[PDB]
Design a protein around this ligand. Structure first.
Ligand SMILES: CCCCCCCCCCCCCCCCCC(=O)OC[C@H](COP(=O)([O-])OCC(O)COP(=O)([O-])OC[C@@H](COC(=O)CCCCCCCCCCCCCCCCC)OC(=O)CCCCCCCCCCCCCCCCC)OC(=O)CCCCCCCCCCCCCCCCC
Ligand code: HEA
Ligand SMILES: CCCCC/C=C\C/C=C\C/C=C\C/C=C\CCCC(=O)O[C@H](COC(=O)CCCCCCCCCCCCCCCCC)COP(=O)(O)OCCN
Ligand SMILES: CCCCCC/C=C\CCCCCCCCCC(=O)O[C@H](COC(=O)CCCCCCCCCCCCCCC)COP(=O)(O)OC[C@@H](O)CO
Ligand SMILES: CCCCCCCCCCOCCO[C@H]1O[C@H](CO)[C@@H](O)[C@H](O)[C@@H]1O
Ligand SMILES: CCCCCCCCCCOCCO[C@H]1O[C@H](CO)[C@@H](O)[C@H](O)[C@@H]1O
Ligand code: CUA
Ligand SMILES: [Cu+2]
Ligand code: NA
Ligand SMILES: [Zn+2]
Lengths: 102, 44, 55, 40, 75, 49, 72, 136, 254, 514, 91, 227, 70
């Protein structure tokens, strides 16, 4: 299912000792698919970035969620809404909040 | 043998004006040849 | 006849920097020169015959 | 592909020269011949 | 006689052999008829057919070769 | 930082387009090329016999 | 093995060649010179040969090969 | 050339190495700070972290350009230059065309083509009115 | 290097070979049109010299320098098979010419095959002897191959001598048959297809006999091992090709 | 060192380089010839005042573009450079014989140039049909020199075919199967098979023409019982496979280019691309007589050849749809090489479809030996092969030289060429439909407008060729050395740097068999 | 009779090196495909080399037509960028 | 003949050329179907920021990508082959005429009854009468009866030529030593022009064919007067 | 709160709709040619010949002087 694919990916990013190679491989693999990843995958990815002390890759992950949406301009706003508690809690600023969209 | 950019070629690219002259003789001799063949034949 | 392959093996594997076509020694260089000279001189002659036939 | 800056930049002037010499190398010999066809 | 009819032996665009066969048949027919005091005029059919189909230069050359003894067809 | 195309893009586009049209029109109409267009609706037939 | 092929070489191959040789070099002699007829499809000359007088084939045999005008 | 390298590619968002390899004094201090809460980093520091890891942002790497104007315009100039060659060709290479292109020849020829009913179903004579003795 | 392939020393023979081709071809042109054989003789001479030194160098590289690893040998196998395939297709064109003419004889021929006035060779006379000769030579070379693999110097040399003698016998026989034939190459398409097809085949017999001779002398000089002798295998493949082409010619063109 | 390196080479890269230089030179000769054809036809009447010369020019145009520009560039140039790299081989199987395949071409070209310098040249067409090309209608040396030119080119390509087949079968890593080699490697192997089988048949036919001209054979002379039509079968038995040989390596490079600039790690439907090239290779040998539908062939034979010829659209359509499906979902980089490839796909399809029109022997009655055929093959062959060559050349120039081109100048070059070739050749369809013969030095007055336009288009393409020479100079003049290349994980030829060292894969790749 | 040398007696240079190494079950000239290990961090594929880097091709799944190529450097084991299987250089 | 700015075929003069016109329309419609499908699909592929770069399953398209082209080919080949065999169906001609190619002119022979023959050369440009066609007119035209099935036999006395008349749908190579047949039938009187269509040397461009189609009675009158 | 939009299979979805579109347009474009060109041709031939009088056509050509034979 959709559900089973999602849960594999959430589980992947949740590995407590996930390393940096593994985080990059995860995200680079994921954006090859015909899909914008679900909030709960991105959530799990962001928290890996946290465990890995990697703020920049957290920002880049949000940019690539936007990018994968293409001309469908409702998916990014939406995923951000769903990520806000995690963004607030980890102090992850958005690309827009950083001026990285200009 | 010489290795690297500008070194794996039978022509020199040390000076771009001498290269220009060599490329111009090269391609222009090829392009001109038919017109001189035609001249040759008409003059027969 | 006797098997002298071992001698030719030592000659052709002598660590002297020569390419295989000259490694037999002095008579290689001769035959090479005769070959190349006939080839080039023959090619000159063929261009001469072309010039001649072109008119 | 990414590349290092030109080792020997070719300015617009130098390109205009390159281009002009290039074009005349094709155009002058052929034009000589075509102009003189009648003569042959 | 208007022109040479369709001949199922020679149904293709290459009609070389149709001309050839009718030239041969004219001369074979005349030979067989003249040997046996038969009506030579019957052979005229083949002459009409070959005259329609064959190029004049082919007829002329073959005629010259028969006169020469160098015609290679069997008559 | 502005690139080659930001600086010279519209000038290249405008004058190139202008040069191209002008020189082709001049070639087509001003130097005696006979295009041999259809006579239909253009030529008046004339007695030939 | 080698012994099989040696057997075939001396038992079948070379004897066959010896018999054909005997038969050819007994049934040779020389036979009747064919009569000449100047057929237009034979003795073709569209350009002179590049040897001899131009009119003789490379293995021309006066005995059995006529020229366009007949036997020599 | 054999070493892992950096790329900005939108389907390879996290490249094999960081944009900036060798870090100054303060840049290392900043990396140490990154290990504590990110809420405690400023906006400027978050951007600086960004730019140590990455060269261009998504928006930058995806930017549009004006290159099409240079390409189309330049092509059109070259095409125009070609017409100069053709003028030079018409003036200095070509002699006169055959007399059959004279206006009177064409007029006679056209009548003769209508008289033999050249292309009378669609192509040519079809377009001539034989009753009214004019083009349709 | 830690692969098993052969990086060949820079060589002049490709260039002398290519120039030898220029000289043979411009030579033939001079011969056909300008009545002179000098250029052609120079080209033939340069071609022979190139062939000798080039193949000399291949023996140096293999027997003497040890560069023919199994992977290299495997490549040469493919190369020789492919070379033979190209030669088969070359001959195919002459077989096509022969059937074209013979199955649809034109009026100039008398509308028949053989043409009027052509007296074909009798295939049960010398051409049968030619057949026995090449067949027997296919038998002898197979003995030579088996003698080599078994380690037997003397019998390899005997078998290979016999094979060569047979190829030379075929060549003398064909030269005599050419001389004796009452028709010539100029006797229309009958002569054309006969002499050009058998002629190329005869050229290939000469070539293959030469190749067997080189193998003979290399065997005399102990170059071949009981397990490594690809120059011999290639000469045998080429010779079987020569045999098979003759067989087709024998069945078809006679 | 210079002689050792450039005359006595045994190095696949340097040999590749030689071939590219020769091919580029030949292309200048062939373009000049083309301009001469189009200047003769640019207005009604006679420019050259000598139709034998016109015929000589047309004939040489074709041989130069085919035997000295396309084949040496695609197989000798890209083939030598890329194939070994793409399978991690240290060189070609027969690296010395490889050098002779190269060195046979200048003398071949010299023979051809000689043919046009002596007597009144070979005004025969590239088909060299007797009796026009025989010793009465073309007395003298010219035709013989042409035949010899073709023998030498033939030998060059036959030995090359042996070398590529051997290399591609025998010199892969031991874990790599043939279905784990890149498509360009497949396309070269298949082209090599076609060359190995087809060129000896041509060699046979032209040798027969040689003997009819000089040894009094009559293979093609009715007086001897020969048949001019035999020469046609043997020529086109080669000639059909030849047109596929001209496009196959272009198919290969297009797959690589489309894949790369779509940001993909692999082409869509690899197995189908292999199957399609093998199918085209095979079918390419059983269609030749569609070159002969007006010679007077039996109706069932015309039906067969019509049918068989059309079948080739099936595997070909699979390749076109698979290129589109590679584009599908891509991060599209609008590089100059990507533009060449997209232009290829479109222009090749148009030419392919006019081929299907001609496959119909009934309609071919009216289109044969007209400008419709000339339009067909200048779309599929001239533009298709040339666009693939340009694409490949732009795309791999940095690998071969270590320098980058100016991408904007390369895009301009593409745009001018695209206008030029369409203006030259699209109107030729109209000329053909309306009955203008090919191989004509002048035409009835009705055909003046389309000829005028076509000739104008030829000059635009001239401008593009001159610009291409400048663009290459500028790259060598400025010396922008390569830094990063992306997607090396699925483009092995790049992984040793730009340019790669003289010797690559001295240590072979390590590949497990699991 | 005999008289024909054997490879053991007369093979020389690289042919001889390859023959003698094969006897000992070694492949210094890379004629055979190396057999994979499980390829984990603990059981990495051991990649011999005569320098400090070598190109690996990884066929990630059997009958993939795409091979994944990368430089393996001396030092810590590296992972195929497609499938992650581990490879370690042993110079 | 052709006219200035013409895009497609000369108007049909014979039923067979009319067939070829309709079959060409049918086939070009298919050409346009295909080429427009490809162009539309290419720009579709090239116009979205959405991506999918992971491995795609190729087997799903195997069937349509081969079957639909196969069906389209059948839709071309059926009418193609019907016309092929219809053209070939038994000709019962009323008249046979031969033409021989030469360097550089055509001869004609009408030898059903009398031995009528003549040469036909291009009118040089300097000798054209006012309104006559450059490079097309000949001195002696091929006069033929309209509304009759005519067998034309074609050969050559020297090199290859090819006898073509576009408007009647005809093109038959002229090969020395070979007699090629085609059949000709005109629906209308008039003048119909063709040009040599196998390269035959320096004057290949300059040896046209002009058919003059008239009622039987005028053909017989002319025949008798050309003896 | 924003509702949850479709996030999976967007490229595939665009293709499924646009392929139907591609076939419609391409069929439309080809059928336009058949209508504007082929059907016009069929009609122009049938109408030309429906009451065509070849002898009358001949007499007009004769009167104009075009023929060698009449
Ligand atoms: C019509 C017949 C058919 C003709 C076919 C013609 C085309 C075939 C071309 C094929 C190329 C063959 C090259 C063979 C070796 C060349 C030797 C030579 O002549 O040297 C002069 C020249 C070197 O000039 P340089 O830059 O001063 O060289 C300094 C060297 O570093 C250091 O040099 P050095 O100091 O060590 O050596 C000095 C000297 C002495 O040293 C030597 O020992 C060598 C001398 C013998 C060499 C003979 C070569 C003959 C080859 C015949 C091919 C035919 O050698 C010479 O430089 C003088 C020899 C002059 C001979 C003239 C022949 C030139 C080549 C053919 C041109 C075609 C014109 C045909 C005539 C047509 C008229 C109708 O090299 C060339 O001419 C190559 C062609 C010119 C380069 C044009 C550049 C265009 C770039 C386009 C890019 C597209 C490819 C992309 C790939 C790029 C990335 C990899
Ligand atoms: C690159 C070279 C090349 C290629 C690949 C081809 C490809 C084909 N060509 Fe062409 N052709 C030549 C070069 C080539 N042509 C040359 C040089 C000549 C003449 C030489 C001379 O006389 O001098 C010639 C002449 C020639 C003739 C002879 C015409 C005549 O002289 O009267 C014919 C006849 O059938 C022909 C047909 C074909 C066909 C059917 C294809 C097919 O392979 C095309 C298949 C491709 C497509 C159809 C497009 C892609 C497919 C799809 C998008 C799928 C869907 C399509 C359909 C269902 C139809 N060609
Ligand atoms: C050598 C083999 C083939 C060359 C071509 C023809 C020779 C055919 C065999 C032969 O030797 O034929 C002879 C004629 O030879 C002749 O013309 C001999 C002609 C001698 C010159 C040889 C021909 C020169 C042309 C060589 C072309 C070779 C092209 C090879 C290209 C290979 C393709 C890559 C037959 O003798 P004859 O007196 O006519 O008839 C017998 C009467 N008693
Ligand atoms: C009257 C005048 C007569 C003149 C006629 C002259 C014409 C042709 C000459 C005949 C051919 C001679 C070929 C000799 C090749 C010798 C080199 C050789 O045989 O080289 C061998 C490799 O094979 C290899 O290259 C294989 C190389 C294969 C060569 C193929 C030869 C056929 C080519 C003929 C040319 C055809 C012309 C066609 C015309 C239409 C070496 O490897 P081995 O043998 O394993 O040895 C190694 C062991 O010792 C280790 O223990
Ligand atoms: C590509 C290389 C092809 C090589 C072809 C070589 C051909 C050699 C031809 C030599 O022929 C010389 C002429 O010999 C012929 O004519 C001579 C009289 O002039 C005779 O004495 C000879 O017996 C022979 O009939
Ligand atoms: C396998 C095919 C057979 C080819 C074998 C060729 C080798 C033989 C070469 C010798 O040929 C020469 C022919 O020479 C004979 O006839 C020639 C012409 O009348 C004479 O000049 C010669 O004196 C000789 O009598
Ligand atoms: Cu007669 Cu062309
Ligand atoms: Cu074809
Ligand atoms: Na003209
Ligand atoms: Zn992997």
């Amino acid at each position: 299912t959709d559900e089973e694919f999602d849960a594999r990916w959430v589980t992947y990013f949740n590995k407590p000792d996930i390393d940096a190679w593994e985080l990059r491989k995860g995200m680079n693999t994921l954006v090859g698919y015909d899909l914008v990843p679900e909030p709960k995958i991105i959530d799990a990815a962001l928290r890996a970035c946290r465990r890995l002390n990697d703020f920049a890759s957290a920002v880049r992950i949000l940019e690539v969620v936007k990018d994968k949406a293409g001309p469908h301009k409702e998916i990014y706003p939406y995923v951000i809404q769903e990520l806000r508690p995690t963004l607030n809690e980890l102090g992850i600023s958005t690309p827009e909040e950083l001026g990285l969209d200009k | 043998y010489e290795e690297g950019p500008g070194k794996n070629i039978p022509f020199s690219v040390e000076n771009k004006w001498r290269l220009l002259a060599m490329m111009t003789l090269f391609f222009g001799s090829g392009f001109a040849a038919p017109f001189f063949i035609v001249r040759h034949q008409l003059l027969k | 006849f006797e098997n002298r392959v071992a001698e030719k093996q030592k000659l052709f594997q002598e660590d002297n920097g020569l390419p295989v076509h000259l490694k037999g020694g002095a008579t290689d260089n001769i035959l090479y020169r005769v070959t190349m000279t006939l080839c080039l001189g023959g090619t000159l002659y063929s261009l001469y015959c072309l010039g001649w036939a072109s008119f | 592909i990414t590349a290092k800056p030109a080792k020997t930049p070719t300015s617009p002037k130098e390109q205009a020269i390159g281009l002009s010499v290039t074009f005349l190398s094709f155009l002058l010999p052929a034009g000589w011949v075509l102009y003189h066809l009648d003569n042959y | 006689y208007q022109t040479a009819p369709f001949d199922s032996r020679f149904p293709n665009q290459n009609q070389t052999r149709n001309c050839w066969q009718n030239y041969l048949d004219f001369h074979r027919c005349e030979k067989a008829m003249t040997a046996k005091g038969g009506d030579v005029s019957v052979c005229e059919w083949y002459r009409r057919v070959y005259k329609s189909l064959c190029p004049i230069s082919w007829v002329s050359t073959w005629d010259d070769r028969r006169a020469e003894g160098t015609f290679p067809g069997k008559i | 930082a502005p690139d080659f195309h930001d600086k010279y893009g519209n000038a290249v586009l405008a004058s190139g387009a202008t040069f191209c049209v002008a020189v082709w029109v001049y070639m087509a109409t001003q130097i005696g090329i006979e295009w041999n267009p259809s006579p239909v609706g253009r030529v008046t037939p004339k007695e030939w016999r | 093995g080698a012994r099989t092929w040696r057997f075939l070489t001396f038992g079948l191959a070379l004897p066959s060649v010896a018999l054909c040789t005997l038969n050819s070099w007994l049934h040779s002699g020389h036979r009747e010179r064919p009569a000449f007829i100047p057929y237009h499809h034979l003795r073709i000359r569209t350009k002179p040969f590049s040897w001899g007088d131009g009119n003789h084939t490379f293995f021309h045999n006066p005995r059995v090969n006529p020229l366009p005008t007949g036997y020599e | 050339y054999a070493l892992p390298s950096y790329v900005d590619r939108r389907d390879y968002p996290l490249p094999d190495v960081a944009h900036v390899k060798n870090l100054s004094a303060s840049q290392k201090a900043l990396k140490e700070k990154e290990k504590a809460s990110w809420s405690s980093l400023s906006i400027d520091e978050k951007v600086e972290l960004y730019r140590l890891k990455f060269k261009e942002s998504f928006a930058e790497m995806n930017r549009s350009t004006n290159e099409w104007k240079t390409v189309v315009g330049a092509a059109m100039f070259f095409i125009g230059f070609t017409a100069l060659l053709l003028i030079w060709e018409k003036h200095y290479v070509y002699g006169p065309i055959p007399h059959t292109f004279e206006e009177e020849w064409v007029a006679k020829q056209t009548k003769r083509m209508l008289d033999m009913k050249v292309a009378p179903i669609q192509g040519f004579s079809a377009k001539w009115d034989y009753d009214k003795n004019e083009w349709k | 290097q830690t692969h098993a392939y052969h990086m060949v020393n820079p060589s002049p023979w490709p260039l002398t070979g290519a120039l030898s081709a220029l000289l043979m071809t411009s030579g033939l042109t001079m011969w056909f049109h300008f009545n002179s054989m000098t250029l052609l003789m120079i080209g033939l001479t340069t071609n022979m010299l190139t062939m000798y030194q080039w193949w000399r160098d291949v023996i140096r590289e293999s027997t003497f320098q040890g560069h023919h690893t199994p992977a290299v040998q495997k490549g040469l196998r493919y190369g020789m098979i492919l070379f033979i395939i190209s030669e088969v297709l070359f001959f195919t064109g002459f077989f096509w010419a022969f059937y074209h003419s013979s199955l649809a004889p034109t009026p100039e021929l008398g509308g028949c095959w053989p043409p009027t006035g052509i007296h074909p060779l009798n295939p049960l006379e010398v051409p049968l002897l030619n057949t026995s000769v090449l067949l027997a030579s296919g038998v002898s070379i197979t003995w030579a191959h088996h003698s080599l693999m078994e380690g037997d110097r003397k019998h390899m040399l005997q078998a290979l001598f016999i094979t060569i003698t047979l190829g030379v016998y075929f060549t003398l026989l064909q030269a005599s048959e050419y001389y004796e034939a009452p028709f010539t190459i100029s006797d229309g398409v009958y002569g054309s297809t006969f002499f050009v097809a058998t002629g190329f085949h005869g050229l290939h017999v000469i070539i293959g006999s030469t190749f067997l001779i080189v193998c003979f002398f290399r065997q005399l000089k102990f170059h071949f091992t009981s397990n490594h002798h690809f120059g011999f295998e290639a000469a045998a493949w080429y010779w079987h090709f020569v045999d098979v082409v003759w067989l087709f010619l024998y069945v078809s063109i006679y | 060192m210079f002689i050792n390196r450039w005359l006595f080479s045994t190095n696949h890269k340097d040999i590749g380089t030689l071939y590219l230089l020769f091919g580029a030179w030949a292309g200048m000769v062939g373009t000049a010839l083309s301009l001469l054809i189009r200047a003769e036809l640019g207005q009604p009447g006679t420019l050259l005042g000598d139709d034998q010369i016109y015929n000589v020019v047309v004939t040489a145009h074709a041989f130069v573009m085919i035997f000295f520009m396309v084949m040496p560039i695609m197989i000798g140039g890209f083939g030598n450079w890329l194939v070994p790299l793409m399978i991690g081989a240290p060189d070609m199987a027969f690296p010395r014989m490889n050098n002779m395949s190269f060195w046979l071409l200048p003398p071949s070209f010299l023979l051809l140039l000689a043919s046009s310098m002596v007597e009144a040249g070979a005004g025969t067409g590239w088909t060299v049909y007797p009796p026009l090309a025989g010793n009465l209608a073309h007395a003298g040396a010219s035709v013989d020199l042409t035949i010899f030119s073709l023998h030498l080119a033939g030998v060059s390509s036959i030995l090359g075919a042996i070398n590529f087949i051997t290399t591609i079968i025998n010199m892969k890593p031991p874990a790599m199967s043939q279905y784990q080699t890149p498509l360009f490697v497949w396309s070269v192997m298949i082209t090599a098979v076609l060359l190995l089988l087809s060129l000896p048949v041509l060699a046979a036919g032209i040798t027969m023409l040689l003997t009819d001209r000089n040894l009094n054979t009559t293979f093609f002379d009715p007086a001897g019982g020969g048949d001019p039509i035999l020469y046609q079968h043997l020529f086109w038995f080669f000639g059909h496979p030849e047109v596929y040989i001209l496009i196959l390596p272009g198919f290969g490079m297009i797959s690589h280019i489309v894949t790369y600039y779509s940001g993909k790690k692999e082409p869509f439907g690899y197995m189908g691309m292999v199957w399609a090239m093998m199918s085209i290779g095979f079918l390419g040998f059983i269609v030749w007589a569609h070159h002969m539908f007006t010679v007077g062939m039996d109706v069932d034979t015309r039906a067969y050849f019509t049918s068989a010829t059309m079948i080739i659209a099936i595997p070909t359509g699979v390749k076109v749809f698979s290129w589109l499906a590679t584009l599908h979902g891509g991060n599209i980089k609008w590089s100059p090489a990507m533009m060449w490839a997209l232009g290829f796909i479109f222009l090749f399809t148009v030419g392919g479809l006019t081929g299907i029109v001609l496959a119909n022997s009934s309609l071919d009655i009216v289109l044969h030996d007209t400008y419709y055929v000339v339009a067909h093959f200048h779309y599929v062959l001239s533009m298709g092969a040339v666009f693939a060559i340009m694409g490949g050349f732009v795309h791999w120039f940095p690998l071969f030289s270590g320098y980058t081109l100016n991408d904007t100048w390369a895009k301009i070059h593409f745009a001018i060429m695209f206008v030029g070739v369409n203006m030259t050749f699209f109107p030729q369809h109209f000329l053909g439909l309306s009955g203008m013969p090919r191989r004509y030095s002048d035409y009835p007055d009705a055909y003046t407008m389309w000829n005028t336009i076509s000739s104008m288009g030829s000059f635009i393409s001239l401008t593009a060729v001159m610009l291409m020479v400048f663009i290459i100079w500028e790259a060598f003049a400025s010396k922008r050395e390569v830094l990063t290349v992306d997607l090396t994980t699925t483009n092995l030829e790049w992984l040793n740097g730009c340019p790669p060292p003289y010797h690559t894969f001295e240590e072979p790749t390590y590949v497990n068999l699991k | 009779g005999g008289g024909v040398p054997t490879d053991e007696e007369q093979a020389t240079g690289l042919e001889r090196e390859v023959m003698l190494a094969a006897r000992k079950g070694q492949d210094p000239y890379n004629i055979l495909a190396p057999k994979a290990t499980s390829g984990t961090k603990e059981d990495p594929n051991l990649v011999p080399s005569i320098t400090n880097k070598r190109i690996v091709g990884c066929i990630c799944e059997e009958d993939n037509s795409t091979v994944i190529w990368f430089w393996l450097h001396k030092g810590e084991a590296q992972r195929c960028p497609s499938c992650g299987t581990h490879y370690k250089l042993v110079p | 003949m052709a006219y200035p700015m013409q895009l497609g075929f000369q108007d049909a003069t014979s039923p067979i050329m009319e067939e070829l016109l309709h079959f060409h329309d049918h086939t070009l419609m298919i050409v346009f179907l295909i080429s427009s499908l490809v162009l539309y699909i290419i720009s579709l592929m090239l116009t979205t920021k959405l991506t999918h770069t992971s491995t795609m399953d190729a087997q799903e398209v195997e069937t349509i990508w081969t079957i639909l082209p196969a069906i389209i080919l059948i839709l071309i080949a059926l009418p193609s082959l019907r016309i092929l065999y219809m053209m070939d169906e038994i000709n019962n001609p009323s008249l046979t005429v031969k033409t021989m190619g030469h360097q550089w002119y055509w001869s004609y022979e009408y030898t059903d009854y009398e031995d009528l023959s003549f040469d036909s050369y291009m009118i040089p440009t300097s000798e054209l009468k006012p309104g006559e066609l450059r490079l097309l007119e000949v001195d002696n035209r091929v006069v033929l009866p309209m509304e009759m099935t005519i067998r034309m036999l074609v050969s050559s006395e020297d090199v290859l030529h090819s006898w073509a008349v576009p408007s009647l749908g005809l093109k038959t190579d002229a090969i020395p030593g070979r007699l090629n047949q085609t059949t000709l039938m005109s629906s209308r009187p008039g003048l119909y022009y063709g040009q040599c269509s196998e390269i035959c040397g320096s004057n290949h461009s300059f040896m046209p064919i002009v058919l003059e189609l008239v009622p039987l009675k005028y053909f017989e009158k002319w025949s008798a007067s050309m003896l | 709160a924003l509702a949850k939009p479709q996030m999976r299979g967007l490229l595939a979805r665009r293709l499924r709709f646009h392929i139907v579109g591609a076939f419609m347009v391409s069929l439309g474009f080809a059928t336009f040619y058949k209508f504007a060109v082929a059907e016009k041709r069929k009609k122009a031939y049938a109408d030309f010949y429906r009451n065509y009088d070849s002898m009358k056509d001949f007499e007009e050509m004769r009167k104009a002087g075009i023929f060698q034979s009449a």
